[PDB]
Enzyme design. Sequence first.
Site, PDB file in Angstrom:
ATOM      1  N   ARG A   1     -55.043  82.268 -63.442  1.00 48.31           N
ATOM      2  CA  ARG A   1     -55.234  83.547 -62.452  1.00 48.31           C
ATOM      3  C   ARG A   1     -54.246  84.333 -62.383  1.00 48.31           C
ATOM      4  NH1 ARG A   1     -55.371  81.981 -56.775  1.00 48.31           N
ATOM      5  NH2 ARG A   1     -53.581  83.375 -55.972  1.00 48.31           N
TER       6      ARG A   1
ATOM      7  N   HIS B   1     -63.913  85.421 -54.426  1.00 46.86           N
ATOM      8  CA  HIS B   1     -62.754  84.445 -54.900  1.00 46.86           C
ATOM      9  C   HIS B   1     -63.253  83.280 -54.167  1.00 46.86           C
ATOM     10  CE1 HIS B   1     -59.832  87.340 -55.043  1.00 46.86           C
ATOM     11  NE2 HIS B   1     -59.627  87.558 -54.133  1.00 46.86           N
TER      12      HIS B   1
ATOM     13  N   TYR C   1     -50.936  90.699 -47.022  1.00 53.57           N
ATOM     14  CA  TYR C   1     -50.423  90.966 -48.343  1.00 53.57           C
ATOM     15  C   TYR C   1     -51.101  92.576 -49.041  1.00 53.57           C
ATOM     16  CZ  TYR C   1     -52.520  86.207 -49.226  1.00 53.57           C
ATOM     17  OH  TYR C   1     -52.963  85.309 -49.371  1.00 53.57           O
TER      18      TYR C   1
ATOM     19  N   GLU D   1     -64.564  84.386 -49.260  1.00 51.77           N
ATOM     20  CA  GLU D   1     -64.515  83.127 -50.328  1.00 51.77           C
ATOM     21  C   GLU D   1     -64.762  81.549 -50.242  1.00 51.77           C
ATOM     22  OE1 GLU D   1     -59.860  83.185 -50.567  1.00 51.77           O
ATOM     23  OE2 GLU D   1     -60.394  81.519 -52.141  1.00 51.77           O
TER      24      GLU D   1
END
Lengths: 301, 301
Positions: free
Chosen positions: A54, A107, A155, A169
């Site tokens: 990751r 993602h 974020y 995603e």
Amino acid sequence: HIQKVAIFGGTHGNELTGVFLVKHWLENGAEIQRTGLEVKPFITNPRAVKKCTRYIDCDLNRIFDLENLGKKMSEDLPYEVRRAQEINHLFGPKDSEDSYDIIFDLHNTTSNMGCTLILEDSRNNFLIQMFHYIKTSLAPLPCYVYLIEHPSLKYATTRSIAKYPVGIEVGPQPQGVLRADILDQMRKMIKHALDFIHHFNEGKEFPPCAIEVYKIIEKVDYPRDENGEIAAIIHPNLQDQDWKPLHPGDPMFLTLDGKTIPLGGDCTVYPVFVNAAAYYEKKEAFAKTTKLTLNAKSIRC
Amino acid sequence: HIQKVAIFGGTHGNELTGVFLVKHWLENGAEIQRTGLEVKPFITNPRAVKKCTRYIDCDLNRIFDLENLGKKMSEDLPYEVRRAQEINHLFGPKDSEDSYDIIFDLHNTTSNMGCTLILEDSRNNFLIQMFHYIKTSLAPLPCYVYLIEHPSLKYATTRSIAKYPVGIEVGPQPQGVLRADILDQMRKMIKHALDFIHHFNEGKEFPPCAIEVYKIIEKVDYPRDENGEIAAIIHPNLQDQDWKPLHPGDPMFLTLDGKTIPLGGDCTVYPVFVNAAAYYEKKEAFAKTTKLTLNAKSIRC
Ligand SMILES: CP(=O)(O)N[C@@H](CC(=O)O)C(=O)O
Ligand SMILES: CP(=O)(O)N[C@@H](CC(=O)O)C(=O)O
Ligand SMILES: [Zn+2]
């Protein structure tokens, strides 16, 4: 109007679909080229891709803020912080007018979510219109939109460098695993996203539109024990039921005994990132969202 | 006849079903206790569990041989080698008569394989009879048997310390993810395996029986690049089709361009561990097996 577009893969090194597509397009990116439009594929975290992990030192996808991008460059910094700067200097700087216009950050999740678009600003007409186009173009293949606007959450993501940051995603795929169907789904997501930009740069006029998004409200923790270890697991009826409505009566967790632990609260919620692997690291079960509709105006030029 | 039985979890630290069951049973192992029978749950690789990773220095499940178990103990050894020894000294020594009688080693795969039993000796009547019992007891829930006997292969596995090593594998589950259904399936596998041992120690006589197993013949590599990177991916029609027959005509891989790569060879094969995550590390696509039937005699106290 839109000039500089980039596509990021390998922001997390074990989410392979992005890595593979990007690597393939670096050697031959005709698929993603549109007339009068310069689109650049790019691996964001090559070190973590190499290890199929990751991240190396810290998560690359939460440090593109002033706290970190303003630090004095040095070899003593965490790898991802150095890297974040190198990227901001390539595709940014952030909050600048010399930054790329649009960035797609790719993602994968283990959660059964299918094609997912990630929206950072709810009042952005341009993005909503794009997301509408994509959604529509994919039909009857479902495509969901997840809104991360929050006063106190949200974020500093890799893509956030752009005027228009777009998150992509696709699940469910295990980490360190490359499935064909998932890959195909992300490809189609891209082609329509690029088609939209081209249609827009050829000056097509889009009428107002409306889309359902899912607004994050809370992240739910796994119930723990007196040592702090996880005590129950996503209940069978919640497994793989991302996006679908969950009412206060309904089952949530299950102990190894196993008594059920039901939802609680006084309203229906929509769970997303159900049993996501990346949530275990922080010991979280899933995200509570609120479903709602957003509107855009018309646009041109 | 059968006295010492053990259950291993966390041989790989990101395969959580075993970890969870074992930890739960260390606190309360009444579920696995049977009359006149002492079964001991045990975490094999606690360090890798802590990090939620496959292994620390090297794979624990490949090093229970003379090459490694005979090395001189020291703190300069890879962690897993030290650990392997500590385990051999607890539950073994291997090839000794003071070794445990039976060991179950618990595992998870991302491959769509369901309940899987792993057989190391094809001529073993005791194990075949157990595997038969479990298979039949689980019905209509499917349960497959995978035979690793091979002249030109090895596998010095954790469980191999026992007179009767038993391997247990349940997929599909991502790494670092704990699904309820998968957990439940492994529980049932265990219960019937313990039931069988108890039935046997109460001196039940089992008639001869026959079971289909799948004999490994080789492991298929992903087609590679001119650099050595992976070039194609499991074809959609092969994804999730573990155990099902694949004929020389049929599609195998798929390049990002579109071109399919079909099977070849001159006979039907049965693929297992299709698109397994643990196979990527070594850049392998799946395992070719040959389906066949094995026979056992009767057995008694
Ligand atoms: C499951 P993920 O690693 O793609 N989630 C991201 C969010 C994102 O992709 O924007 C994160 O928490 O960093
Ligand atoms: C997914 P796993 O590591 O438990 N299985 C091994 C084989 C095994 O554990 O017997 C492999 O696929 O490499
Ligand atoms: Zn991610």
